[PDB]
């Protein structure tokens, strides 16, 4: 069956190699005859599958690499907790979080950057932050710098431990194949073990530490004399004072009359007006139910005993009439090629990151989070960016799998075979859908702008003119606002407040959430999003499906994954490798994310965020001009892009001045990218040649023969600089604007 088989001490911890670069690649280890060697060295370091031919060694290598990654993550967490401990105003922030700006970074007074340590309130000076740690540290009842300090220490310990574990598992006790390739027990554990018990232990930490101290702070007390956590579990009488049921030990649970615990485990829903956040009772019930669900899920597959399924015994049964034999053998494909798994997991992880970004703003989990505007905004846009990048990586590695490790002779399948057998139909129909959406979602904006600039407003696309109504969205919102009436009696309000029914939650003269109406502008922006997503999918899916062989080049696969072209023959064959398909799709994903985040910023600052008067009149941060100025590109310039770019541009000579400076460098690089994206190579090669002559004239010609970057590396550096410029520009814009006005 399945056992603990491993091997002993393959590679010794000897520095013999560190002084010899490129030991892994036979060609690289010979020596740098030119300068392209030092590019090619970094370029293929992590390329494990091109260093061997057996999956055992590359599996060991990736097992060690995961430990390296985890060590870096732990070190980052430790740095964060430290800087919170020794360099923040966290205690003053806890004193009253309504109007005290979270700052967690000071700068040394050397070169005039003292102005960076701007006024943040609470007798502190420091660069304001928007990471949003403080809402978490108030949720977990840290409420003391000693806790941050010791947590940073423990994080450092875990980091060193993981680094050790890595070194040991690669060098000394290397796992074997029948361990890795055994996915049944891995699924079994990770379902039951990691996620379930994780959520369970967190529910523990919440019901036994957070809930009481948070309730006390909501009652209003200086956290100095707030009783320490362990003094809430050792002596029961405190929790007894809080929750009568909680003073009944464990009888009401075991004896199946769970309703007694109804006080601290409940299903209220909505938000908590004391902090706008979620009712921690609800989130505790959530984490606990999720723990139980993962535990009961974990027991699916047979591992050693006689019960349970087998991932081979599940696929082959499914075989429909149209497709034929079904998923037979697919189990072998997804167990014999790492790149396949990397692609699948990257896709699912990007999608989950996006849905996390979405669910965050509309249901603020933490307390006093939906009122620190910049934090909410920055979190949402960061998660969106991460999701986009993960998705593109998924597509790229899927293409790499399609090229290298796919083969019908032994890694056969009858499903993917059919899929590839009609690729042309797929790409054609997706292309036509892309054209259709492009037309009927952007030409609408063009028509609206034109009919505006021609003095014919009553022929526009808006509520006051020829009208388009997003009826399905309002239908769903009505349903979600009337569902807690009959369908979900156990709830108290709608699942969130953004559903089109209820009241508004406002703390400290500022609003946090309220109903959200949808106008024709929302219809148009949603169709823009749909179109751009469809085009990115078109690019990447075409790349994957045509990575093997196209009707232009018959044997593309033999030429490898990443090569620049196939010469200028047959009318020119530039950018045919799947690698170049990903190079293209990157820009379109960037554009999709950019327009999405702009739409989000405008919609929030024009319909939700803002301040509330003493009487109750709302005056939003931007005045609520969305439904009347999002329908013209010229509007986007005037109402949003130009106007709300003030705070970044007057930012010189103030605390926010750093956000100003980047706003130029971001643009600059942004420029710079074109120089690599537009030019070619031969020109630069000849220029380098003349420069080498000019040097050689002075007996300075270096033996590391200069060489203009190879084509693929040129495109890579170009796209990297371009993404950097764009993202840094929107980053500076967002931070400066929101943290200045809000």
């Amino acid at each position: 069956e399945v056992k603990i088989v491993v091997d002993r001490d393959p590679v010794k911890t000897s520095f013999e190699e560190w002084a010899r670069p490129g030991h892994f690649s036979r060609t690289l280890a010979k020596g740098p005859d030119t300068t392209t060697w030092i590019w090619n060295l970094h370029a293929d370091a992590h390329d494990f599958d091109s260093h061997t031919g057996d999956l055992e060694e590359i599996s060991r290598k990736v097992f060690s690499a995961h430990f390296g990654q985890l060590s870096i993550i732990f070190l980052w967490l430790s740095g964060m907790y430290f800087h919170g401990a020794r360099f923040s105003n966290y205690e003053a922030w806890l004193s009253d979080p309504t109007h005290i700006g979270p700052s967690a970074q000071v700068v040394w007074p050397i070169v005039g950057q003292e102005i960076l340590n701007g006024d943040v309130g609470g007798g502190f000076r420091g660069i304001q932050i928007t990471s949003g740690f403080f809402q978490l540290w108030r949720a977990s009842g840290i409420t003391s710098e000693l806790q941050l300090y010791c947590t940073a220490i423990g994080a450092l310990v875990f980091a060193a431990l993981m680094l050790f574990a890595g070194w040991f598992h690669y060098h000394k006790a290397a796992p074997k194949l029948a361990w890795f390739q055994d996915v049944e027990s891995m699924l079994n554990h990770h379902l039951a073990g990691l996620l379930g018990l994780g959520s369970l232990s967190w529910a523990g930490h919440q019901i036994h530490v957070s809930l009481p101290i948070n309730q006390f702070l909501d009652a209003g007390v200086d956290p100095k004399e707030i009783p320490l956590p362990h003094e809430f579990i050792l002596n029961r009488d405190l929790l007894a004072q809080l929750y009568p049921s909680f003073a009944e030990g464990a009888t009401p649970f075991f004896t199946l009359n769970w309703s007694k615990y109804a006080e601290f485990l409940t299903f209220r829903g909505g938000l908590d007006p004391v902090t706008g956040g979620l009712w921690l009772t609800d989130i505790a019930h959530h984490h606990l139910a999720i723990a139980i669900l993962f535990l009961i899920a974990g027991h699916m597959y047979r591992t050693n005993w006689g019960i349970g399924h087998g991932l081979k015994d599940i696929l082959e049964a499914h075989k429909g009439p149209f497709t034929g034999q079904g998923h037979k053998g697919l189990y072998e494909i997804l167990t014999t090629s790492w790149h396949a798994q990397l692609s699948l997991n990257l896709a699912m992880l990007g999608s989950t990151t996006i849905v996390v970004a979405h669910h965050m703003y509309s249901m603020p989990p933490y307390p006093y989070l939906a009122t620190d505007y910049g934090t909410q905004l920055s979190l949402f846009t960061h998660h969106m960016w991460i999701g986009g990048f993960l998705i593109v990586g998924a597509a790229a590695h899927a293409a790499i799998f399609m090229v290298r490790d796919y083969d019908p002779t032994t890694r056969y399948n009858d499903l993917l075979d059919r899929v590839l057998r009609h690729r042309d139909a797929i790409i054609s129909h997706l292309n036509w859908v892309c054209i259709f959406l492009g037309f009927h979602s952007f030409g609408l904006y063009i028509h609206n702008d034109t009919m505006s600039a021609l003095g014919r407003p009553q022929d526009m696309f808006s509520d006051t003119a020829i009208q388009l109504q997003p009826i399905f969205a309002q239908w769903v919102q009505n349903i979600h606002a009337t569902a807690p009436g009959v369908t979900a009696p156990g709830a108290t309000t709608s699942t969130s407040l953004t559903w089109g029914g209820g009241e508004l939650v406002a703390v400290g003269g500022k609003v946090a959430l309220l109903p959200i109406p949808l106008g024709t502008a929302d219809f148009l922006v949603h169709h823009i999003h749909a179109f751009t997503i469809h085009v990115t999918v078109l690019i990447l899916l075409k790349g994957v499906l045509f990575a093997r062989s196209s009707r232009l080049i018959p044997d593309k696969a033999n030429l490898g994954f990443r090569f620049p072209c196939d010469g200028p023959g047959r009318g020119g064959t530039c950018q045919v490798s799947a690698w170049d398909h990903v190079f293209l799709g990157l820009f379109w994903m960037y554009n999709a994310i950019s327009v999405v985040i702009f739409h989000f910023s405008w919609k929030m600052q024009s319909d939700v965020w803002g301040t509330i008067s003493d009487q109750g009149v709302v005056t939003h941060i931007t005045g609520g001009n969305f439904a009347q100025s999002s329908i013209t590109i010229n509007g986007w310039l005037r109402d949003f892009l130009w106007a709300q770019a003030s705070q970044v541009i007057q930012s010189y000579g103030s605390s926010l001045s750093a956000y100003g400076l980047f706003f130029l460098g971001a643009h600059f690089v942004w420029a710079f990218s074109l120089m690599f994206l537009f030019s070619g190579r031969g020109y630069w090669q000849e220029l380098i040649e003349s420069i080498v002559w000019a040097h050689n004239k002075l007996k300075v010609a270096p033996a590391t023969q200069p060489r203009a970057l190879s084509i693929i590396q040129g495109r890579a550096v170009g796209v990297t600089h371009y993404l950097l410029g764009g993202i840094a520009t929107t980053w500076a814009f967002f931070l400066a604007r929101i943290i200045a006005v809000g």
């Binding site: 232009l552 080049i553 196939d566 200028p568 047959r570």
Partner: protein, 81 residues
């Protein structure tokens, strides 16, 4: 005749082009101007698609087989429709 191929006496008769010719254009013929006593030849330039992969192989001083471009045709363009 759409494109055009040329071969020059710096041919060392190493025979990499033919092995890398995608559409069966070149071949070798008995010569007396190298050890291998064989030089290139292009009697099938009609199907010459135009990719430089052939002369991307010739490891001579500068080159020994050139691919000069010209007008276009239906087969010199990889057309399949």
């Amino acid at each position: 005749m759409s494109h055009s191929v040329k071969i020059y006496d710096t041919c060392i008769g190493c025979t990499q082009c033919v092995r890398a010719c995608p559409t069966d254009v070149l071949e070798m013929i008995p010569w007396d101007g190298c050890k291998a006593k064989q030089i290139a030849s292009a009697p099938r330039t009609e199907d010459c698609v135009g990719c430089k992969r052939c002369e991307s192989a010739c490891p001579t001083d500068f080159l020994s087989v050139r691919v000069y471009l010209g007008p276009e045709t239906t087969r010199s363009m990889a057309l399949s429709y």
